[PDB]
Amino acid sequence: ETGNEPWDPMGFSQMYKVNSLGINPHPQWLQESEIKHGRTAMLAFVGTLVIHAGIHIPGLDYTTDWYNSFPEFAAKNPLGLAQVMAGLTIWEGHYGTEAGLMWTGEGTRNPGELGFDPLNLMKGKSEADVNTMKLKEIKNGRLAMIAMAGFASEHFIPGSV
Amino acid sequence: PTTKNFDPLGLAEKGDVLFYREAELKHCRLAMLAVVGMVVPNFVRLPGDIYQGVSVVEAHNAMVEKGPMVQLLFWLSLFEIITAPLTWNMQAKDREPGDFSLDPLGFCKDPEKKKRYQLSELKNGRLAMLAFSGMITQAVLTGHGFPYL
Amino acid sequence: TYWEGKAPPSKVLGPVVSQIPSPALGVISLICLGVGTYSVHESNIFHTLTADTINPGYIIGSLLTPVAWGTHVASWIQKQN
Amino acid sequence: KSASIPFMPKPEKLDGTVPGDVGFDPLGFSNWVNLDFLREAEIKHGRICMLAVAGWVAVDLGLHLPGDVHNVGSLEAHDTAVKFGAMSQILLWTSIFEAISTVGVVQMLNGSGRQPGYFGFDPLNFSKDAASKAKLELNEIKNGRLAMLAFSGIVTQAALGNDFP
Numbered sequence: 001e002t003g004n005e006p007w008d009p010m011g012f013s014q015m016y017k018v019n020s021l022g023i024n025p026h027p028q029w030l031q032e033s034e035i036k037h038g039r040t041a042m043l044a045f046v047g048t049l050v051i052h053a054g055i056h057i058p059g060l061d062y063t064t065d066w067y068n069s070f071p072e073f074a075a076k077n078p079l080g081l082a083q084v085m086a087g088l089t090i091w092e093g094h095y096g097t098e099a100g101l102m103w104t105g106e107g108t109r110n111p112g113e114l115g116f117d118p119l120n121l122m123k124g125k126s127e128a129d130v131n132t133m134k135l136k137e138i139k140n141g142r143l144a145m146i147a148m149a150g151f152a153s154e155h156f157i158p159g160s161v
Numbered sequence: 162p163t164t165k166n167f168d169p170l171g172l173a174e175k176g177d178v179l180f181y182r183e184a185e186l187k188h189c190r191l192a193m194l195a196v197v198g199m200v201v202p203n204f205v206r207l208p209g210d211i212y213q214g215v216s217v218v219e220a221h222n223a224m225v226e227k228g229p230m231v232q233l234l235f236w237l238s239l240f241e242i243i244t245a246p247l248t249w250n251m252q253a254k255d256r257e258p259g260d261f262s263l264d265p266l267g268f269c270k271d272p273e274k275k276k277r278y279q280l281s282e283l284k285n286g287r288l289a290m291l292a293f294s295g296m297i298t299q300a301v302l303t304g305h306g307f308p309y310l
Numbered sequence: 311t312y313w314e315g316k317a318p319p320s321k322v323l324g325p326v327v328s329q330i331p332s333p334a335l336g337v338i339s340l341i342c343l344g345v346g347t348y349s350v351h352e353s354n355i356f357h358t359l360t361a362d363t364i365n366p367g368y369i370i371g372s373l374l375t376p377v378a379w380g381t382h383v384a385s386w387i388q389k390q391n
Numbered sequence: 392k393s394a395s396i397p398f399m400p401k402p403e404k405l406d407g408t409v410p411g412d413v414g415f416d417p418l419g420f421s422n423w424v425n426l427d428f429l430r431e432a433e434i435k436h437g438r439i440c441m442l443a444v445a446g447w448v449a450v451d452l453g454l455h456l457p458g459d460v461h462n463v464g465s466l467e468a469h470d471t472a473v474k475f476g477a478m479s480q481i482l483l484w485t486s487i488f489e490a491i492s493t494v495g496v497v498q499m500l501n502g503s504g505r506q507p508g509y510f511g512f513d514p515l516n517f518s519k520d521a522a523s524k525a526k527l528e529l530n531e532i533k534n535g536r537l538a539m540l541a542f543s544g545i546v547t548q549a550a551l552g553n554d555f556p
């Protein structure tokens with residue numbers, strides 16, 4: 001907890017005060033981008049941890065070491081790559097309109113709130129339903145981004161542990 | 162079971178009830194036909210060399226090689242395409258899930274009888290889906306025939 | 311046809327497209343994009359194109375990709391209202 | 392509310408005044424395009440297919456003159472008629488007629504008021520003599536629809552052998 005207050009050294013949030021005709025992102029866009037990056041980083045941490053030491057999914061070949069995985073993935077299973085790309089494209093397209101409106105303050109959709117509740121959770125009452133767990137998600141996502149950066153840096157220089 | 166409201170996930174939120182109920186009805190009807198198409202072919206075989214001793218576990222692939230499956234796919238796909246606006250509109254005023262017409266001449270006018278018949282259809286169709294899942298899985302796992310064991 | 315706000319009037323799509331409901335345009339655009347990408351990939355990516363490999367069908371499919379973009383834009387315009 | 396498909400509501404733009412109306416627009420095509428254009432397309436397809444069915448049957452049974460007689464089955468007629476130039480001539484003349492029909496139909500859809508599938512071609516004046524040409528128009532549309540389906544069949548059947556029925 002960095003003082004339990006907005007931690008913005010270099011003040012990247014405040015530049016929305018200068019209109020700049022919409023050149024500078026509004027805080028909502030940055031918030032949504034941060035949550036996206038955190039979620040991607042945590043799932044990528046799971047992937048790195050397992051694939052680096054893992055039997056790998058039963059399938060054609062699929063012998064990889066987490067750094068050469070994507071070319072092997074594309075070559076061995078073209079249909080799989082095709083459907084992955086198509087599904088991600090569909091998901092991004094369904095949203096994105098709201099993200100486009102989120103560059104300004106016209107998002108109309110709470111940042112990072114997508115229609116994904118496979119298990120209903122209306123228990124929370126404080127602010128946004130269980131706002132505290134939203135903070136938990138963002139925190140572990142920040143840490144996951146740190147972890148992805150750490151593995152990528154350890155790649156070139158054995159930076160640490 | 163009886164007077165039991167399950168929906169443990171609670172999917173009504175962020176969803177259209179009429180859409181899901183129409184989906185349920187179509188699934189149910191096709192699964193009932195699936196159960197009887199499982200049962201009958203073994204006892205009774207359509208005339209023709211192609212339709213002889215194909216077996217039910219291996220029916221799909223063999224008939225895909227031959228004409229039949231493509232034909233039935235074409236006709237069912239045509240009917241499904243024809244039925245697009247009914248699903249897309251999701252209008253309450255529009256006919257409730259299931260065809261409003263084509264009902265046999267012997268359909269009770271009483272609203273209570275309509276509810277009873279619709280409930281019977283839904284229950285026997287849910288049994289259909291469960292029954293076919295068991296049937297095909299036990300068909301592939303075990304031997305062949307109506308017992309599937 | 312000058313328009314302000316966040317969604318253009320349907321008349322921009324022309325006499326025919328402007329009457330098509332959004333889901334129809336969306337499905338048509340998906341089909342067109344799939345066919346066009348598949349055609350462009352089958353020739354010159356998955357298979358090298360030669361003098362005696364010019365399929366008119368693949369050329370039409372490849373031309374169908376800009377149609378897919380136009381139809382997806384039109385579908386969004388119809389969706390906003 | 393549709394006579395053909397009662398599940399669907401009565402399609403818009405299909406008032407019933409048009410001959411051959413059975414309220415069949417399950418995909419709502421009529422709403423998409425100007426109706427008179429679609430009607431002209433239907434009538435033209437039907438006329439062409441009536442002519443095509445008659446030609447297929449006649450060629451399969453009887454043949455015109457030498458060169459034309461050698462080709463026999465209509466399957467191997469496009470090629471032969473291309474070779475000795477008949478296709479080029481009929482293409483030229485049909486193209487001239489269609490080109491004039493372009494401006495003819497452009498006048499329509501702009502308020503000219505031409506009836507769909509209307510020309511001055513009534514030398515025997517069957518419809519002109521009869522005040523009730525609705526019977527004739529409905530018959531034309533229905534026999535043309537049957538001809539469309541029948542030609543589609545005949546072609547896709549003879550392309551797979553099946554000799555002659």
Ligand code: CLA
Nearest residue numbers: 089090092093094095096097100336382383385386387389
């Ligand atoms: C400039 C091209 C362009 C334009 C104007 C649009 C516009 C639109 N798209 Mg499409 N789209 C595009 C490219 C484009 N898209 C591409 C390349 C893909 C991937 C194949 C998609 C995939 C896609 C999906 C799957 C969906 C949309 C949807 C939409 C609509 C709402 C969402 C949206 O705009 O943000 C979405 C944001 C993006 C897709 C990011 C695109 C960013 C591009 C790549 C940047 C390139 C532009 C660049 C600045 C041009 C510089 C040129 C210069 C060098 C000469 C909107 C009408 C949605 C829709 O129609 O719903 C009804 C929808 O579901 N789009």
Ligand SMILES: CC1=C(C#C/C(C)=C/C=C/C(C)=C/C=C/C=C(C)/C=C/C=C(C)/C=C/[C@@]23O[C@]2(C)C[C@@H](O)CC3(C)C)C(C)(C)C[C@H](O)C1
Nearest residue numbers: 227228229231232235411413532533534536537538540544
């Ligand atoms: C005229 C008229 C009317 C009418 C009418 C009528 C009678 C309509 C008739 C419709 C009709 C008769 C439609 C036939 C379809 C045949 C199909 C779809 C074939 C698919 C064929 C397929 C899928 C082929 C596959 C195969 O080839 C493959 C690949 C290899 C071979 O081993 C053979 C097989 C087959 C296996 C209305 C309706 C009353 C209204 C109107 O107002 C007036």
